[PDB]
Design an enzyme around this catalytic site. Structure first.
Site, PDB file in Angstrom:
ATOM      1  CB  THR A   1      -0.844   0.027   1.240  1.00  0.00           C
ATOM      2  OG1 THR A   1      -1.668  -1.059   1.126  1.00  0.00           O
ATOM      3  CG2 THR A   1      -1.747   1.241   1.361  1.00  0.00           C
ATOM      4  CG  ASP A  17      -2.311   1.564  -3.532  1.00  0.00           C
ATOM      5  OD1 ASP A  17      -2.298   1.747  -2.296  1.00  0.00           O
ATOM      6  OD2 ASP A  17      -2.059   0.461  -4.061  1.00  0.00           O
ATOM      7  NE  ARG A  19      -0.487  -3.684  -7.484  1.00  0.00           N
ATOM      8  CZ  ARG A  19       0.560  -3.470  -8.277  1.00  0.00           C
ATOM      9  NH1 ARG A  19       1.794  -3.437  -7.781  1.00  0.00           N
ATOM     10  NH2 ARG A  19       0.374  -3.282  -9.576  1.00  0.00           N
ATOM     11  CE  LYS A  33      -4.775  -0.399  -1.146  1.00  0.00           C
ATOM     12  NZ  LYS A  33      -3.304  -0.597  -1.229  1.00  0.00           N
ATOM     13  N   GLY A  47      -1.446  -2.074   5.700  1.00  0.00           N
ATOM     14  CA  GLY A  47      -1.026  -3.188   6.541  1.00  0.00           C
ATOM     15  C   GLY A  47      -1.870  -4.414   6.264  1.00  0.00           C
ATOM     16  CB  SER A 129       4.965  -1.070   0.588  1.00  0.00           C
ATOM     17  OG  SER A 129       3.798  -0.983  -0.213  1.00  0.00           O
ATOM     18  CG  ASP A 166       5.683   0.213  -3.162  1.00  0.00           C
ATOM     19  OD1 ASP A 166       6.635  -0.584  -3.026  1.00  0.00           O
ATOM     20  OD2 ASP A 166       4.669   0.189  -2.431  1.00  0.00           O
ATOM     21  CB  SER A 169       1.431   1.038  -4.322  1.00  0.00           C
ATOM     22  OG  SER A 169       1.941   0.977  -3.001  1.00  0.00           O
TER      23      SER A 169
END
Ligand code: MG
Ligand code: MG
Ligand code: MG
Ligand code: MG
Ligand code: MG
Lengths: 222, 231, 244, 196, 195, 243, 241, 204, 250
Positions: A1, A17, A19, A33, A47, A129, A166, A169
């Site tokens: 994330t 995001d 994902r 999210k 998380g 992340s 990343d 994400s």
């Protein structure tokens, strides 16, 4: 994330995001999210997905009951305190990393909570992340006295840094805007810069392709 | 009357009738006497029987090497309270390597009895006790009553017709208090004291019970042929 | 202490009866009459509502007849609120049995447990008993169609036809008169309504003062169906037997 | 972290850097490690952010409840409450806290509470990872009964050095002045303190 | 423990269960019956951790016998198997789980069909034409895949079982000291004495 | 009626008769007093000598709590001990958590809440004592009196038991004649006098006098008993004033 | 009639123990009064020290619950302090749990709920007290909320409590008819205190020295009580007018 | 000693035009040993369908649990549970066992009886809801199912076409997994008819 | 110490009555009138705000309470008992339903839960029954609009329209004349206002009347936008002004 929060003139904006992963596999390409705790308090979560949903729903429930009990609009610092004390009690085993934001009778607020229960205050924050990709953008472009439209741009740019750079994400950008004196606007799929290209071929099969041994009508009635 | 149904109820004059009724079981108890000098402390108790075929109810209980008591009233209540004292003396030795002060033994018994006078469901203890001991400040005699009141004395007596012995000791005060370094004379003065409470019966060999503690004397109990010396 | 205010709900009279149980039955005797009738091919449950008002919502209402599982129902006489406590317990108990054995609970076993719960309130805990009598109507593959009743004492017994609530004396005499063993459901339906019609304390028996249920093998082959009658369906069955 | 508290003529000053760290990543460069548990009783937090926050939050609750019943608590009392939590939960805490407050009877006071939950009353106290590098400096330069400006300078120079050598420490230098006059918040940015 | 098999044929279920009990380098016993009758038409064989096996079997036996008395009725094999599974499914998340694997062979009198249920210590239930626990299955399943037919007689079943035991006696590393064989059918439970 | 048979029941007046009945047990008890002074407090009590056989000096009734608080009471003695045992627990827990010894007002409310708690339920009986107590904390000297209802206030002087009226009248005079204050050594002597004056209302049996004090100067802020030359000096002063 | 000893219904649907707890409310024979300014909420109560031996400074029926909330009690002091201690604990816990200062009206509701429980549950007696809570709430401004042994509570423009409460109430009602507003239109709390004392004097028909009164004032972010001297200054200013 | 891959098995679900499909293999093994060829992993409560992969004892237990809960729901609510609601009940129930979880990968499929909308959702072992327009995958060949579905799938397939698509996704995913296969079942679900088809597949 | 009252305080008398329930119903009779009327597209619940002093601010006392966004309650009887029941009713809607199913409970089931709490006060140790009757109006997707009465016994009944408290016998009669199955919400509000005037003595305006509806969804009352399926609460309290507007065309 990747998730972010950015304060502006008359409120606060958060983004994320969409994902969801299981190891290197993408489980969900469009998961939400951004979590509503109360109508004007929204929470971005990174998380362990189930943990962020449960802890956000539980505190959301208790905030509602509190708001009813007190006959008052709920405050962000209440959600913050309830979340942090819950997460602290569990010593990090509930893997929820949250950016808490909203407006209430006291003003506009932005916080972050880590899974072990530590909280931060700031004008711009990022977790997950993709937080370093995002923070690089925020540190590059943030200024004091942002307009609503500037803050949204900054926030979604910070999520994009996460999406592109990343591997944790990707997909879309969700945004929620909490301005003082106004209804919060949840902007689901505010950006969709990862639309799948047309496939080269249709794989629709000739009917009868699949070998069958038996059929039967299933009874779903009483 | 309307206020004697339980220990948790004050009467309109501020009395606790269940406690007063507990006190009444002591008056029906066989007589026992305690007295002391500056070197020894003595218990004499008249034991009672059911009939001629029965034993004579033991009235004196050792609590530690330096402490013990005589009872008058409900005996099982003396067993409970003596057992509690045994533990308290014991806790003092194991944890502090310290012989329990007779004064503390008194305060502990008071507080144990008191809890049963303020709560619903319980009952006061139906027994009175005379505690003797020799500790770091010499000889001691204590009188326990189940109201919770504990009192330190040179001498006293409780049970049926205890007023005779208690008057005698009030007269004999200046004599017995100075029977220092002389065990048998202090006992004799207690045996004489208990005799002021006898009626139609006299002290026999399996009727009399005596105990003594002092400077170089562990708490010890005498019955049977070992008390013939005093009749 | 509090001893003073204790009514002592679980004691015997000098005659060896349980005061509270007896007084609970007295309460139940003023409740809307409920009737169970068992036939060779099914069961009927009929029950009278307590004096209705015209403004009551009759179609979305449930006072007398409750579904325990797919194969078992009950008719209530007494305190509705007390009965709902017991009903949810019975419903849960059925699901525990199903979960444990992968088989629907035999009717008696469910009845016994509910009756055992009632018995407990008469022997320990210092609480008042539940002011409820049930008629249980159910089916299983051991005994087929079964009627039982339980009351505040926790005693239960099995029946071909039975009434609970008000006027059970009058009602039981009438069922005893016209009941016969080879009877069908449709005859049983008629008997149930006729019996209420003559025992009712009201001027005349109408659809809006009734609840009605059947447990037939009247679905397709080897299987059982529960029918809790809608208001219009009671109105029709009331005409079809000539009571209105 | 680099933190310290220094008694002086008029009261006490607390000081701290602003860096919060997860590994080598700076999770927050503008942290506030000087925390109010009462009007004029504050603490400097070092160790686990979660632990020290949870602790300060509990202490603030206790002292608010103390205040409602018995009036203003002493700095010693505040330090005792911190100790009790730190000592009794020593197995599950990573918290090195400095407690500092101003009475009108007792003037400025500093108690430091290291990992074990021992209590140590001192003229001044230093703590956190960055403190190791300024034991030498602080021992040589501290005097009792300094003025406000001298104390601000002592803290500014000391934490400047702690920050210079400790990578875990950094950002701004925050201070909190506790005197009869009231409560004053000071801040000092890199461009000032770096070139001292 | 170790070897327990089960075969369901046209009109019966047959359980075969090894006779050896070994602790260390010693065969302590060569005549052990690894089975308990749960009801007149239901038999359970078992294998696993020492002590746990019998303790579990006897506990289930007691529970089913209690049920029978209370209802004056015999639970169906399906019902018994489901009760057993649930008991094991509870056990697996206990402080100390029962480490017992079982086969339940029963004749359902209401359906007039034999039934074989295989359940491991986790509470994993399956109904099967033939089943085994432990290393046994690694030899027998392939063999029964080949020679088993659904319409076999009790006698054909016993011969099919003799093949299984022969193979196990050839290829298994340990001496399991032969098997006790039991048949469960419409007339209850009986033991074949010569095998 | 029957409103007086059960603790915690309000009568139609708004009273709890069981507490009022507990007050009668207090009025039945021996006289005890407290006198507040310049930098401390003095406590005194009448000990009835029932018999020659009571060992003099060795049935002590005044009780210390922590190192700095004294407590005396009139009524059911064991009830008083039970209360002090709780006071000792309350002071220990305060000092354990907050380090400083318990302030006297703070200590007063601890006892107050505990006694008031025994008027809330029918499963307990109210305390059969009125309790006079106090000492020296960081704000100075404090004297308190606490009744079976849980009611307590701060006092200049306080008295309870059979001789409360006599003692009260004697206390009111001291307050009037000493508006700038009374010294600790003075108050000790006055305490002795007032107990002797109050003994008039209990004169069948003669008595033993017991006194204690906390003074910032005379005892360094700690509770000590008055014995020896100082006790005898105050007895003499009291003997001289009844004659 | 054991339905008069514990909190169960009488045949007429009443709770006599609750009603008798209301009568204990007046045992102290004190009257209290609360009004609101623009910026503040003032509460005054009579102070009666009969005994000369009492330390008058320790005699109070006003309590500082939190920094922002004050409470005056009408009823016996043991019950009063019981309620004060609980209210203090409840306001501290609320602050720790929810991150902001407990509002006057929420604390009032919570204490009212506790009182309600004593009316329904038998082992607990009602407290013989009426609790008047005052503050300057950060959302609602000057606030007065009052609790009784029935578990009832409500907000007030102004209120009074005690034996001669009716006289004070009507006096205040009459003022607000005339002013046409919900509060005392006055800038300083000093003059709002002066109003409160003035209208208590008119209603009760008595004069007051500095030791006959006890005054509590709530402003934004603090509630405080007044010293004898703060009150004397206030009495002086009324007389010189 | 990884509970989710002891028994083996897979489940996949897909949406089409006014229809949904849910399919599962039939294998139950103990690691390398195949044991049962008849272990179905799809259950239904009214018109809501639930597939469950993972540890087989938990598959069985959860079926028995959701049957329990849906029966009580129906008795109290006087209506059958809808898939959106059931999905929430599944999530609640798994998260209740947060620190001692059931080792499963549930999948919900069904058509809402009021709105007519097709609905699918997937869950991790701890209750997280994965909702999707297109498809949900689960089990020991989940990587393979993901790859099949992501290429084979297209929106708005008619029931007879969706059948071919889902069957081919399952079958070819199963054949690249040692612990999946040994049979297969597919459920085609329309507003008020449900067709169950057993597929012919390789038995190794 | 501790609750020694583990026995029932409500018990059967020889005649079979449960005294404390009867006596609680009597407390409800003494209580101020409240009522509910069910229309085709809404429900209305209403009551009088009987103020204890005119110095009281009766807006701070809310007799009509939101339980969920689509359910509301009003009562007759003892106000304090009502207040704690609302607290418990709100909480139980979450713990026993929303935290399980992710949606709010339907009206009958929430009512079922409140009834359970009131039945337990009728049988559990050491407590008296609640001294209130509730009227609970609500809407849910699969049952539409509904109106329930809940008594001290724990019994509940669905109503087309009813009233409770002081002037209930009269008001129930008034409602039988005026009620039909074709009433639009506004017509039901009008009837509620007429029915209530008969039982109110003093002033009769939007400051002495408290009245809420379960009607259409109110997106303006939601507090946020962006989720199409979240359309806002069907519970709405009518304002002082909104009531007076309807009292003119009376
Ligand atoms: Mg930790
Ligand atoms: Mg640095
Ligand atoms: Mg009560
Ligand atoms: Mg394969
Ligand atoms: Mg293979």
């Amino acid at each position: 994330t990747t998730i972010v929060g950015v304060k502006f003139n008359n409120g606060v904006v958060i983004a994320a995001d969409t994902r969801s992963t299981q190891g290197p596999i993408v489980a969900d390409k469009n998961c939400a999210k951004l979590h509503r705790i109360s109508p004007k308090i929204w929470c971005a979560g990174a998380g362990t997905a189930a943990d962020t949903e449960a802890v956000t729903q539980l505190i959301g429930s208790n905030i509602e009951l509190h708001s009813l009990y007190t006959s008052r609009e709920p405050r962000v610092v209440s959600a913050l305190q309830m979340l942090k004390q819950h997460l602290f009690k569990y010593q990090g085993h509930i893997g929820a990393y949250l950016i808490v934001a909203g407006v209430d009778p006291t003003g506009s607020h932005l916080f972050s909570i880590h899974a072990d229960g530590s909280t931060d205050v700031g004008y711009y924050l990022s977790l997950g992340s993709g937080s370093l990709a995002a923070m690089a953008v925020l540190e590059s472009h943030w200024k004091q006295d942002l307009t609503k439209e500037e803050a949204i741009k900054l926030a979604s740019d910070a999520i994009q840094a996460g999406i592109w750079n990343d591997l944790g994400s990707g997909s879309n950008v969700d945004v929620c805007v909490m301005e003082i004196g106004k209804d919060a606007e949840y902007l689901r799929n505010y950006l969709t810069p990862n639309v799948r290209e047309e496939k080269q071929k249709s794989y629709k099969f000739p009917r009868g392709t699949t070998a069958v041994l038996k059929e039967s009508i299933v009874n779903i009635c009483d | 009357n309307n206020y004697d149904g339980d220990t948790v109820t004050f009467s309109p004059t501020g009395r606790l009738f269940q406690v007063e009724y507990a006190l009444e079981a002591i008056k029906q108890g066989s007589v026992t006497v305690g007295l002391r000098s500056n070197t020894h402390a003595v218990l004499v108790a008249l034991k009672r029987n059911a009939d001629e075929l029965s034993s004579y109810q033991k009235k004196i209980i050792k609590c530690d090497e330096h402490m013990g008591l005589s009872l008058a009233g409900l005996a099982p209540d003396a067993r409970v309270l003596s057992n509690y004292l045994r533990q308290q003396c014991n806790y003092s030795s194991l944890v502090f390597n310290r012989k329990l002060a007779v004064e503390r033994a008194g305060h502990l018994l008071c507080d144990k009895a008191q809890k049963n006078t303020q709560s619903y469901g319980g009952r006061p203890y139906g027994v009175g006790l005379l505690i003797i001991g020799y500790d770091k400040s010499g000889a001691h005699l204590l009188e326990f009553q189940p109201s919770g009141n504990v009192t330190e004395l040179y001498g006293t007596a409780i049970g049926a017709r205890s007023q005779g012995a208690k008057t005698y000791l009030e007269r004999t005060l200046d004599t017995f208090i100075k029977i220092d370094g002389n065990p048998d004379e202090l006992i004799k003065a207690g045996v004489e004291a208990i005799s002021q409470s006898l009626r139609d019966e006299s002290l026999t060999v399996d009727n009399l019970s005596i105990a003594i503690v002092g400077k170089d004397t562990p708490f010890t109990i005498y019955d049977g042929e070992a008390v013939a010396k005093y009749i | 202490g509090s001893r003073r205010y204790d009514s002592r709900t679980t004691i015997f009279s000098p005659e060896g009866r349980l005061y509270q149980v007896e007084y609970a039955l007295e309460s139940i005797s003023h409740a809307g009459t409920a009737i169970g009738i068992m036939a060779s091919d099914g069961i009927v449950l009929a029950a009278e509502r307590k004096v209705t008002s015209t403004l009551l919502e009759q179609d979305t209402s449930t006072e007398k007849l409750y579904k325990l599982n797919d194969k078992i129902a009950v008719a209530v006489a007494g305190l509705t609120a007390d009965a709902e406590i017991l009903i949810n317990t019975a419903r849960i108990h059925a699901q525990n049995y199903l979960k444990t054995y992968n088989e629907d609970i035999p009717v008696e076993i469910l009845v016994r447990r509910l009756s055992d719960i009632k018995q407990g309130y008469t022997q320990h805990g210092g609480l008042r008993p539940f002011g409820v009598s049930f008629i249980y109507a159910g089916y299983d593959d051991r005994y087929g169609y079964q009627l039982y009743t339980s009351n505040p004492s926790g005693n239960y017994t099995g029946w071909k036809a039975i009434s609970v609530g008000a006027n059970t004396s009058a009602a039981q005499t009438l069922l005893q008169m016209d009941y016969k063993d080879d009877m069908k459901v449709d005859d049983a339906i008629e008997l149930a309504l006729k019996t209420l019609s003559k025992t009712t304390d009201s001027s005349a028996l109408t659809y809006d003062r009734l609840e009605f249920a059947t447990i037939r093998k009247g679905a397709n082959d080897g299987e059982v169906y529960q029918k809790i009658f809608k208001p219009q369906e009671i109105k029709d069955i009331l005409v079809k037997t000539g009571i209105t | 972290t680099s933190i310290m508290a220094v008694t002086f003529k008029d009261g006490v000053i607390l000081g701290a850097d602003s860096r919060t760290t997860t590994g080598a990543y700076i999770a927050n460069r503008v942290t506030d490690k000087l925390t109010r548990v009462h009007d004029k009783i504050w603490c400097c937090r070092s160790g686990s952010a979660a632990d020290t926050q949870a602790i300060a939050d509990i202490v603030q609750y206790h002292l608010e409840l103390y205040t409602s019943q018995y009036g203003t608590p002493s700095t010693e009392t505040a330090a005792s409450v911190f100790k009790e939590l730190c000592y009794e939960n020593k197995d599950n805490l990573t918290a090195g806290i400095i407690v500092a407050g101003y009475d009108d009877k007792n003037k400025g006071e500093v108690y430091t509470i290291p990992l074990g939950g021992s209590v140590h009353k001192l003229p001044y106290a230093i703590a956190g990872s960055g403190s190791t590098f300024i034991y030498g400096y602080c021992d040589k330069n501290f005097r009792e009964n300094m003025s406000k400006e001298e104390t601000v300078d002592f803290i500014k120079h000391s934490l400047s050095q702690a920050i210079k050598w400790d990578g875990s420490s950094g950002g701004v230098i925050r201070m909190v002045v506790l005197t009869a006059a009231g409560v004053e918040r000071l801040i000092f940015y890199p461009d000032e303190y770096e070139q001292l | 423990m170790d070897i327990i098999l089960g075969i369901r044929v046209q009109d019966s279920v047959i359980l075969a269960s090894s006779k050896a009990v070994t602790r260390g380098i010693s065969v302590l016993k060569d005549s052990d019956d690894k089975t308990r009758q749960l009801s007149p038409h239901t038999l359970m064989s078992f294998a696993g951790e020492a002590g746990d096996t019998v303790q579990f079997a006897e506990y289930i036996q007691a529970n089913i016998q209690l049920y029978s008395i209370r209802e004056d009725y015999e639970l169906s094999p399906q019902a018994v198997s489901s009760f057993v599974r649930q008991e094991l499914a509870k056990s697996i998340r206990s402080r100390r789980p029962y480490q017992v694997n079982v086969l339940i062979g029963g004749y359902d009198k209401k359906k007039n069909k034999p039934e074989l249920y295989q359940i491991d210590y986790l509470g994993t239930k399956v109904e099967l034409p033939y089943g085994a626990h432990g290393y046994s299955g690694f030899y027998t399943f392939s063999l029964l895949d080949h020679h088993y037919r659904p319409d076999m007689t009790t006698e054909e079943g016993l011969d099919l079982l003799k093949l299984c035991v022969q193979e196990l006696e050839k290829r298994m590393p340990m001496d399991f000291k032969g098997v006790i064989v039991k048949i469960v059918d419409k007339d209850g439970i009986r033991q074949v004495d010569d095998f | 009626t029957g409103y007086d048979l059960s603790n915690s029941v309000f009568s139609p007046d708004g009273r709890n008769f069981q507490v009022e009945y507990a007050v009668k047990a207090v009025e039945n008890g021996t006289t005890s007093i407290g006198i507040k002074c310049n930098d401390g407090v003095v406590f005194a009590v009448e000990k009835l000598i029932t018999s020659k056989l009571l060992v003099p000096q060795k049935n002590v009734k005044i009780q210390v709590v922590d190192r700095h608080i004294g407590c005396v009471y009139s009524g059911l003695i064991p009830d008083g001990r039970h209360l002090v045992n709780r006071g000792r627990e309350e002071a220990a827990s305060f000092k354990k958590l907050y380090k400083t010894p318990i302030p006297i007002p703070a200590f007063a409310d601890r006892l107050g809440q505990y006694v008031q708690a025994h008027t809330l339920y029918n499963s307990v009986r109210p305390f059969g004592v009125s309790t006079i107590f106090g000492g020296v904390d960081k704000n100075g000297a404090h004297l308190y009196m606490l009744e079976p209802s849980g009611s307590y206030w701060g006092y200049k002087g306080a008295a309870t038991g059979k001789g409360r009226q006599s003692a009260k009248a004697e206390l009111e005079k001291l307050v009037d004649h000493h508006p700038e204050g009374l010294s600790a050594r003075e108050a000790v002597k006055q305490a002795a006098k007032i107990i002797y004056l109050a003994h008039e209302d209990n004169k069948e049996k003669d008595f033993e006098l017991e006194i204690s004090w906390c003074s910032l100067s005379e005892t360094n802020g700690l509770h000590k008993f008055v014995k020896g030359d100082l006790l005898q000096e105050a007895i003499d002063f009291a003997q001289k004033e009844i004659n | 009639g054991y339905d008069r000893h514990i909190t169960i219904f009488s045949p007429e649907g009443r709770l006599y123990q609750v009603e008798y707890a209301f009568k204990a409310t007046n045992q102290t024979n004190i009257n209290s009064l609360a009004v609101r300014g623009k910026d503040c909420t003032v509460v005054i109560s009579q102070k009666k020290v009969p005994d000369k031996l009492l330390d008058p400074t320790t005699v109070s029926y006003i309590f500082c619950i939190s920094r922002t909330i004050g409470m005056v009690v009408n009823g016996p002091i043991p019950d009063a302090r019981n309620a004060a201690l609980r209210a203090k604990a409840e306001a501290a816990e609320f602050r720790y749990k929810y991150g902001y200062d407990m509002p006057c009206d929420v604390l009032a509701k919570r204490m009212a709920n506790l009182s309600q429980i004593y009316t329904q549950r038998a082992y607990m007696r009602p407290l013989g007290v009426i609790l008047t809570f005052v503050s300057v709430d950060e959302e609602l401004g000057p606030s007065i909320y009052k609790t009784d042994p029935a578990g009832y509570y409500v907000g007030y423009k102004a209120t009074a409590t005690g034996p001669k409460q009716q006289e004070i109430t009507t006096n205040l009602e009459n003022h607000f008819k005339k002013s046409k507003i919900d509060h005392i239109n006055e800038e300083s709390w000093e003059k709002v205190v002066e109003f409160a004392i003035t209208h208590m004097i008119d209603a009760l028909g008595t004069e007051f020295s500095k030791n006959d009164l006890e005054v509590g004032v709530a402003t934004k972010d603090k509630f405080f009580t007044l010293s004898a001297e703060n009150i004397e200054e206030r009495l002086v200013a009324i007389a010189e007018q | 000693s990884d509970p989710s891959s002891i028994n083996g098995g897979i489940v996949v679900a897909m949406t089409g035009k006014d229809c949904v499909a849910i399919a599962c293999d039939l294998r139950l093994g103990s690691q390398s040993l195949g044991v049962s060829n008849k272990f179905e992993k799809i259950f239904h409560y009214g018109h809501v369908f639930l597939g469950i992969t993972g540890l087989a004892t938990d598959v069985t237990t959860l079926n028995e649990m959701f049957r329990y809960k849906t029966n009580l729901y129906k008795l109290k609510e006087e209506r059958a549970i809808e898939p959106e609601t059931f999905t929430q009940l599944v999530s609640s129930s798994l998260y209740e066992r947060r620190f001692g979880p059931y080792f499963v990968g549930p999948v919900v499929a069904g058509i809402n009886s009021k709105s007519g909308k097709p609905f699918i959702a997937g869950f991790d072992l701890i209750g997280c809801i994965d909702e999707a327009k297109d498809f949900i995958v689960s089990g020991t060949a989940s990587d393979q199912l993901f790859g099949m579905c992501e290429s084979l799938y297209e929106p708005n397939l008619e029931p007879e076409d969706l059948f071919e698509t889902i069957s081919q996704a399952l079958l070819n995913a199963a054949d690249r997994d040692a612990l999946s296969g040994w049979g297969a079942v597919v459920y085609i679900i329309k507003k008020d008819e449900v067709v169950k088809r057993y597929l012919k597949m390789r038995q190794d | 110490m501790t609750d020694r009252y583990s026995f029932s305080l409500t018990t059967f008398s020889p005649s079979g009555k449960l005294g404390q329930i009867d006596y609680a119903l009597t407390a409800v009779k003494q209580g101020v009138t409240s009522l509910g009327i069910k229309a085709t597209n809404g429900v209305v619940i209403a009551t009088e705000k009987k103020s204890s002093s005119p110095l009281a601010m009766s807006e701070t006392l809310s007799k009509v309470s939101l339980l969920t966004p689509d359910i509301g309650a009003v009562y007759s009887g003892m106000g304090p008992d009502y207040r704690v029941l609302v607290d418990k009713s709100r909480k139980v809607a979450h713990t026993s339903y929303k935290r399980i199913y992710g949606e709010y409970p339907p009206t009958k089931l929430l009512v079922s839960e409140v009834a359970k709490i009131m039945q337990e006060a009728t049988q559990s140790g050491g407590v008296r029954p609640f001294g209130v009757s509730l009227l609970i109006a609500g809407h849910d997707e699969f049952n539409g609009f509904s109106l329930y009465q809940v008594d001290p016994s724990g019994s509940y009944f669905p109503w087309k329209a009813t009233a409770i408290g002081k002037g209930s016998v009269a008001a129930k009669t008034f409602l039988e004349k005026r009620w039909n199955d074709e009433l639009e919400l506004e017509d039901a509000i009008h009837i509620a206002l007429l029915t209530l005037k008969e039982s109110v003595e003093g002033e009769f305006n939007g400051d002495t009347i408290e009245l809420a509806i379960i009607g259409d969804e109110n997106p303006d009352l939601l507090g946020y936008t962006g989720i199409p399926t979240d359309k806002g609460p069907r519970f709405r309290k009518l304002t002082s002004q909104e009531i007076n507007d309807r009292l003119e065309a009376l």
